[PDB]
């Protein structure tokens, strides 16, 4: 139940589909080690691993749900790692696609009721609600998201 296995667990469907490069997992772990991405929300801790590099073939969001939170060092420094159960692996090939999706997730995170239900949903329900939220906006077109990219961890 370490962070490296979580990175591999969420990277697996993107390497199989061809959304990211085969060595993507190593680049994103090195990125997390150099610059951690843990966030302490007023609700539940969230991590958003991303590499911002040129290895990724296309844009994708991979969403993992953990029953047993893992300590991720904070984005905004601080001495206390944040326990994270929800992991958003973000792939994209430009600065703008990553930043716009970061803004979109920001709007998602501050929706308290969504997050509270999110903690207790099946993988298909997560797929439907995230898919709906992505499609509702006119931006963020061209980012792949499929049922295979939403999974529970153990």
């Amino acid at each position, epitope marked *: 139940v370490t962070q490296e296995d979580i990175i591999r667990a969420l990277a697996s469907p993107l390497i199989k589909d061809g959304m990211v490069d085969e060595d993507f997992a190593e680049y994103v772990i090195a990125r997390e080690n150099r610059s951690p991405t843990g*966030l302490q929300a007023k609700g539940v801790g969230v991590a958003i691993p991303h590499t911002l590099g040129d290895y990724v073939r296309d844009n994708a969001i991979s969403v993992g749900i953990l029953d047993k939170p893992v300590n991720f060092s904070g984005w905004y420094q601080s001495p206390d790692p944040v326990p994270v159960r929800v992991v958003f692996m973000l792939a994209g090939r*430009t*600065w*703008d696609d990553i930043v716009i999706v*970061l*803004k979109w997730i920001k709007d998602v995170i501050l929706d308290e009721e969504f997050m509270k239900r999110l903690l207790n949903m099946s993988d298909e329900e997560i797929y439907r609600q995230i898919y709906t939220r992505i499609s509702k906006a006119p931006n963020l077109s061209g980012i792949n998201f499929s049922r295979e990219y939403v999974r529970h961890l153990n």
Partner: antibody, heavy 129, light 107 residues
């Protein structure tokens, strides 16, 4: 980190010239780079920016020079170049070469984010007459 | 777009702030650069609160609303320089803009 510009000089109105910027100490391939200019006695104005591999080498030009200036890079020789055509009197000044990074504060920033200049060179002087 | 004070002066050892104004500052934070004539400029302020290496801890930036400022406390003779504010031309744009700058005179 050292950036040394060259190729500046005096050109008559309507002419053309190619400038070059050598950047060493920090890698060209994954980092955006920007040109900025300063007419003597005046403040700075932005000239343009060249993006990295993931953006298709897209180049964003400043409005007053868009469509007239071309910015390009050659990684196989590790040089940055700027080709100027049909220059006019307003284009005179000291041209600086710059490194560019990204900044965005997750909770408070706005897309497409902000761009940060990581360092600048001393510049090459271009005059018109 | 971005308007700066034509020029300011500070007595040696005193604290002053220089204010940058503009419309794009509601959505994006400004960065600050300092240039001394004849030398290449040195980078002074990054984003919200990030001082790069090689810069002393004698000053810092802040921004809110449609205002941004850089506060320099205890100014010394080496601080006489032009200060430049830079930001976005329009919210959401990909083009960057620099203002006319401020000349800081230290006596």
């Amino acid at each position: 980190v050292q950036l040394v510009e060259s190729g500046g000089g005096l050109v008559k109105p309507g002419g053309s010239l190619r400038l070059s910027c050598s950047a060493s100490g920090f890698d060209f391939d994954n980092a955006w780079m920007t040109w900025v200019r300063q007419p003597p006695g005046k403040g700075l104005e932005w000239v343009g920016r060249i993006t990295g591999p993931g953006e298709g080498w897209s180049v964003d030009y400043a409005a007053p020079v868009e469509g007239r200036f071309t910015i390009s890079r050659l990684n196989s020789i590790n040089f940055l170049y700027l080709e100027m055509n049909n220059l006019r009197m307003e284009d005179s000044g000291l041209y600086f070469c710059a490194r560019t990074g990204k900044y965005y504060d997750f909770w408070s920033g706005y897309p497409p984010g902000e761009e940060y200049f990581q360092d600048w060179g001393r510049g090459t002087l271009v005059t018109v007459s | 777009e971005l308007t700066q004070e034509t020029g300011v002066s500070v007595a040696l050892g005193r604290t002053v702030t220089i204010t940058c104004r503009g419309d794009s500052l509601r959505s994006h934070y400004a960065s600050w650069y300092q240039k001394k004539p004849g030398q290449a400029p040195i980078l002074l302020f990054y984003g919200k609160n990030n001082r790069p290496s090689g810069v002393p801890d004698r000053f810092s930036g802040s921004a809110s609303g449609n205002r941004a400022s850089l506060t320099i406390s205890g100014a010394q003779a080496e601080d006489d320089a032009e200060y430049y504010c830079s930001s976005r031309d329009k919210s959401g744009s990909r083009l960057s803009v620099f203002g006319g700058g401020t000349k800081l005179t230290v006596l």
